[PDB]
Amino acid sequence: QDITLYSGRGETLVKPIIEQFEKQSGIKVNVRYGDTAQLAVLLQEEGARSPADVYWGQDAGAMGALANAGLLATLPEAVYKQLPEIYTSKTGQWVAASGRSRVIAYSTERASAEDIPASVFDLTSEKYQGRFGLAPTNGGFQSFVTAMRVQHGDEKTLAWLKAMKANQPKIYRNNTTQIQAIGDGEIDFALVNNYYLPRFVAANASFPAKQTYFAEGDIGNLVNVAGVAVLKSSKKQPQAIQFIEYMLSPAAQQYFTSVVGEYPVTQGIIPNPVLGELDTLLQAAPSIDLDQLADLQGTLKLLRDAGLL
Ligand SMILES: O=C(O)[C@H](O)Cc1ccc(O)c(O)c1
């Protein structure tokens, strides 16, 4: 037996996972690698003619476009019903294999957890002027802004963006350079995806940055996801589902958190010490329909209007 996977996830991440799945299941996985968003475009072009059985992406916006297009199979309840609601389609059209959340990183030399305000909205204050770094070209930042729009509307969101721009940010290419800049003393705070700082702490246990959450439910704690789904057009849904269940298995989940530095979606995983307990993330996370992150173009418009792009 074989299935076809369209992977928005990189081969160096995916390959060991699919190889162990193949070894255990006897099912071969033929993978087309690509950009998360561009593979969702391809799937919409292929429609019912797609050869794909499984789609695995690393941004909820693209998955949402597939869900809205009617291209995803409803998963068995046995796959999704036990997962936290931040990690599943309500109607069972996809599940998170791992959590890719927004956090706030801070200098351990020049700041502390006490400096972190209740809301991401509070970073426009003078207390933070010139002390934070933004990466407005980062996909994680952008989907976070889309989530802020969904939760709070454009006017609040644009006001925040402008106030953040008026607060003298330093502008960086990506999360790695933002975190390095904390180490280097250029900035004391950065809005980042959760899985970069683990990489620094693994290469150097005493890297002088930690990361943490805003208050419970704040949009700054958004949990994006590396979502996986079965195509409605698949004629091999049992095999596709076995693949998904493999990725939710303890060995795969432990790998995602220890090696990839993303949050697990299940209990019983030894936590990455940089991330801490899954229970804390569940308390921190905002309630957001991730399928609503599909509106990237509206977000890029607001960022252009704020002068951040
Ligand atoms: O494929 C990748 O680049 C990474 O696994 C995921 C990633 C991390 C941080 C980002 O800002 C991003 O856009 C993607």
Author numbering: 1 to 309
Study authors write:
Vibrio bacteria require iron for growth and survival. They utilize a ferric ion‐binding protein (FbpA) to bind and transport Fe3+ into the cell. Most gram‐negative bacteria contain the highly conserved FbpA protein, which is considered bacterial transferrin and binds to free Fe3+. Therefore, FbpA can bind Fe3+ in the periplasm of gram‐negative bacteria and transport it intracellularly through a transmembrane channel while consuming ATP during transport (Lu et al. 2019).
Diffraction‐quality crystals of RA‐treated VmFbpA were obtained with a reservoir composition of 1 M (NH4)2HPO4 and 0.1 M imidazole‐HCl (pH 8.0). The RPC results indicated that the binding with VmFbpA was a degradation product of RA, DSS. Compared with Fe3+‐bound VmFbpA, DSS‐bound VmFbpA underwent a 2.1° rotation in its N‐lobe; however, compared with apo VmFbpA, the protein did not undergo any significant conformational changes. Interestingly, Arg199 did not directly interact with DSS, but instead, interacted with one hydroxyl group (O14) of DSS through a H2O (444). When DSS binds, DSS sterically clashes with the Asn193 in the apo conformation, forcing it into a new conformation.
